[PDB]
PDB file of C-alpha atoms in Angstrom:
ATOM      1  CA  UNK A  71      -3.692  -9.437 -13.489  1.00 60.21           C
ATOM      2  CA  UNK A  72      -5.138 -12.894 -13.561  1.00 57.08           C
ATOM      3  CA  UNK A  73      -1.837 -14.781 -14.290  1.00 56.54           C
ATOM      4  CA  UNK A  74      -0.170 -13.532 -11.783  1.00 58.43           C
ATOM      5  CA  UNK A  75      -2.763 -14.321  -8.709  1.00 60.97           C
ATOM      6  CA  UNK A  76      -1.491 -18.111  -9.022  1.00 58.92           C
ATOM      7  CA  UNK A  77       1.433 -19.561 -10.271  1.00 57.62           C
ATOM      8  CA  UNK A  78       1.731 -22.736 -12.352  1.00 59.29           C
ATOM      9  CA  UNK A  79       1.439 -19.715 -15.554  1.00 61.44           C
ATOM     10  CA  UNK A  80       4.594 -18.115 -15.130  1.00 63.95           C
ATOM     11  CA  UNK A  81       5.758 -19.357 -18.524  1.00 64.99           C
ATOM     12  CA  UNK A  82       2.339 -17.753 -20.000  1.00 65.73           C
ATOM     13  CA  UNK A  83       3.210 -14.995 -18.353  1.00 64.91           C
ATOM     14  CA  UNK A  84       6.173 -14.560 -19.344  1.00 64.20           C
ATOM     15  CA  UNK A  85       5.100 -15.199 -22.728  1.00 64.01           C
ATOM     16  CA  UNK A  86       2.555 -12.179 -22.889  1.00 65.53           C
ATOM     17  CA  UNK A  87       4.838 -10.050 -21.490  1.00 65.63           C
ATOM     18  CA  UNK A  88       7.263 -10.446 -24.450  1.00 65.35           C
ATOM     19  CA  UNK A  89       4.661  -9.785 -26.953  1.00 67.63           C
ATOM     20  CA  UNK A  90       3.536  -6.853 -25.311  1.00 69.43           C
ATOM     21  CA  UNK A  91       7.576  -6.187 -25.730  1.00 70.37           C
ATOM     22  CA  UNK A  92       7.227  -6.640 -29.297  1.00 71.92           C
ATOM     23  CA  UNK A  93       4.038  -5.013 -29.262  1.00 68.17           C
ATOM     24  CA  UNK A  94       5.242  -1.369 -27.607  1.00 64.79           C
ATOM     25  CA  UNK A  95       8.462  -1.794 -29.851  1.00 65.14           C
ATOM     26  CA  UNK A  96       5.900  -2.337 -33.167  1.00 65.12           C
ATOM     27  CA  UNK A  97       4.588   0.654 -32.287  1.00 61.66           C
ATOM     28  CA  UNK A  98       6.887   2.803 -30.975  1.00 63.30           C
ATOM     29  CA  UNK A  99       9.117   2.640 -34.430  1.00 60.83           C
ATOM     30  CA  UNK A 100       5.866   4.436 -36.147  1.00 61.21           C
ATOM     31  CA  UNK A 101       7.202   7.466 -34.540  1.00 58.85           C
ATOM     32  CA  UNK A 102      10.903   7.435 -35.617  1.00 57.37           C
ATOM     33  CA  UNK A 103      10.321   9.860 -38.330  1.00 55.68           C
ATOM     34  CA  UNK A 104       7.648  12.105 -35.777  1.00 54.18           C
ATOM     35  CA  UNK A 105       7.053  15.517 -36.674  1.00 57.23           C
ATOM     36  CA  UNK A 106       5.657  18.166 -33.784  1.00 56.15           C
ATOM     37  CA  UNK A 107       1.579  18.092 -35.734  1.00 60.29           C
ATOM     38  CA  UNK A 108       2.258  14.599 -37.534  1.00 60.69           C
ATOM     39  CA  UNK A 109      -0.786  12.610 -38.107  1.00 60.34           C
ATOM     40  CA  UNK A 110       0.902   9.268 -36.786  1.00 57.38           C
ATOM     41  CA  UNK A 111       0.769  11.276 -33.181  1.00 59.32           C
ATOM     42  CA  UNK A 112      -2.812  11.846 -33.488  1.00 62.03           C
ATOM     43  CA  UNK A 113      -3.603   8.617 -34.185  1.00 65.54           C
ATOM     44  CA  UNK A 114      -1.432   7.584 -31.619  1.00 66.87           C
ATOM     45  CA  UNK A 115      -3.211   9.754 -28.757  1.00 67.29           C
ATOM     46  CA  UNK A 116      -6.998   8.964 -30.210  1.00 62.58           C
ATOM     47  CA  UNK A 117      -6.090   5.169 -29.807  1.00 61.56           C
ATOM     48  CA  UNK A 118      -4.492   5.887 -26.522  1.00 63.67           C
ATOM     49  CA  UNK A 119      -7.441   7.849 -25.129  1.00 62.00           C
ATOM     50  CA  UNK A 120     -10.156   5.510 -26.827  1.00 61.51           C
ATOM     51  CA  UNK A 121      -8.532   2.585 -24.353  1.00 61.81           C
ATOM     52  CA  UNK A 122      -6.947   4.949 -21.485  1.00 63.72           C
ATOM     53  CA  UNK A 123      -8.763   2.337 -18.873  1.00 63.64           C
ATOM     54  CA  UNK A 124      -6.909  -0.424 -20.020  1.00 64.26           C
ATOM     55  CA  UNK A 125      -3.368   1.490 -20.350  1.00 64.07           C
ATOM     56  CA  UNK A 126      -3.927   2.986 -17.070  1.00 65.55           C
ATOM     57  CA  UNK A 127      -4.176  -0.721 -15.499  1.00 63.82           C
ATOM     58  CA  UNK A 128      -0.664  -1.762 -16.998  1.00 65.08           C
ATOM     59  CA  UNK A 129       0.375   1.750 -15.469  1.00 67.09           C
ATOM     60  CA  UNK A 130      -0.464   0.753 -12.433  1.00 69.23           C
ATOM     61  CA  UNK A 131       0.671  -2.588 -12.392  1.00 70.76           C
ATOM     62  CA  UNK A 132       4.665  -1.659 -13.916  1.00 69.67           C
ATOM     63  CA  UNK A 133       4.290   1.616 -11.203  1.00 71.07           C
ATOM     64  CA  UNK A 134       3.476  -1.414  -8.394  1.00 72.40           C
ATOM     65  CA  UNK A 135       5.981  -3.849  -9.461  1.00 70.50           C
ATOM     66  CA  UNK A 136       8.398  -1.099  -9.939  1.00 70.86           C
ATOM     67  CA  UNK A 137       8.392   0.503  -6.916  1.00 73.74           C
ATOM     68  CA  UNK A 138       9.231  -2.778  -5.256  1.00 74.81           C
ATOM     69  CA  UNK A 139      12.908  -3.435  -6.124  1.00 78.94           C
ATOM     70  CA  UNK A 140      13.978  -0.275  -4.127  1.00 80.35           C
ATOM     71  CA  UNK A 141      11.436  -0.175  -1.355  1.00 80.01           C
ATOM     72  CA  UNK A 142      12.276  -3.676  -0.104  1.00 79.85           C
ATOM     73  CA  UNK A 143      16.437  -3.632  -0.457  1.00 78.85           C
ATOM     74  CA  UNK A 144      17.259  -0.742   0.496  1.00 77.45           C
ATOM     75  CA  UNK A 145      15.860   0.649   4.241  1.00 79.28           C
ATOM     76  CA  UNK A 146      14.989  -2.238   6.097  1.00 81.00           C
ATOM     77  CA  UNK A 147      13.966  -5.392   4.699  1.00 81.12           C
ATOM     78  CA  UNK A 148      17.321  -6.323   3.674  1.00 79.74           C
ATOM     79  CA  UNK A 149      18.456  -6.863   7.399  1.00 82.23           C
ATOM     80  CA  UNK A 150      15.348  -7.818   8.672  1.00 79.71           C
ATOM     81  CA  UNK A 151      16.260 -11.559   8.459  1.00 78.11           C
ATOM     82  CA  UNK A 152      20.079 -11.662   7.613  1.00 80.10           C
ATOM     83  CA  UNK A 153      19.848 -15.372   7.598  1.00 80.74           C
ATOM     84  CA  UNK A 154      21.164 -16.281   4.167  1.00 80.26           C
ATOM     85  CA  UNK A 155      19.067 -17.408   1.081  1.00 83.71           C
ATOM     86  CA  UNK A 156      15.922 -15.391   1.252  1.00 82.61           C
ATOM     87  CA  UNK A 157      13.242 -16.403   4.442  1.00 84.05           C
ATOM     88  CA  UNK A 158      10.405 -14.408   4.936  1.00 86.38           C
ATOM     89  CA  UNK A 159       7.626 -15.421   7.897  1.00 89.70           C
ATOM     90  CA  UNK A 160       5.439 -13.511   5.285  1.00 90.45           C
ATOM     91  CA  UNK A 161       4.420 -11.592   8.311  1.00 88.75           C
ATOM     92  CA  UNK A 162       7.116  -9.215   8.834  1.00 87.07           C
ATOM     93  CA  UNK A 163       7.020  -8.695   5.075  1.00 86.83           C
ATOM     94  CA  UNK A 164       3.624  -7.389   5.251  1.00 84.84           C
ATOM     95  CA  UNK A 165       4.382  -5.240   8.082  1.00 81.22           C
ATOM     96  CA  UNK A 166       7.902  -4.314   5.872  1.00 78.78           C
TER      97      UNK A 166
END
């Protein structure tokens, strides 16, 4: 949330998002060998619910930024100003 309010961090940015890549990956191969009442799952859900606030933010922030690559090019905005490369008044988008 706070690199992305200004830009001259895009390369930090970009940086944290790959080890939170690696990070999800890490942990997400400690469940390869999962069994339905394994312990690794428990473990897994008390560390999820001990920082749900936290998980819930990224949530929310993929759920925004995901919802955004069909909601703009698909209905409206994409004719809105047929112009060529993209121009935006930044007032219709809002509106959009």
């Amino acid at each position: 949330m706070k690199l992305s309010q200004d830009s001259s961090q895009i390369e930090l940015l970009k940086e944290l998002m790959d080890l939170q890549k690696d990070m999800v990956v890490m942990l997400l191969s400690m469940l390869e060998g999962n069994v339905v009442n394994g312990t690794i799952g428990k473990q897994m859900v008390d560390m999820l619910v001990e920082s749900s606030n936290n998980v819930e933010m990224i949530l929310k922030f993929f759920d925004m930024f995901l919802k955004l690559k069909d909601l703009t090019s698909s209905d409206t905005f994409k004719e809105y100003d047929p112009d060529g490369k993209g121009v935006i008044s930044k007032r219709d988008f809002h509106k959009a």
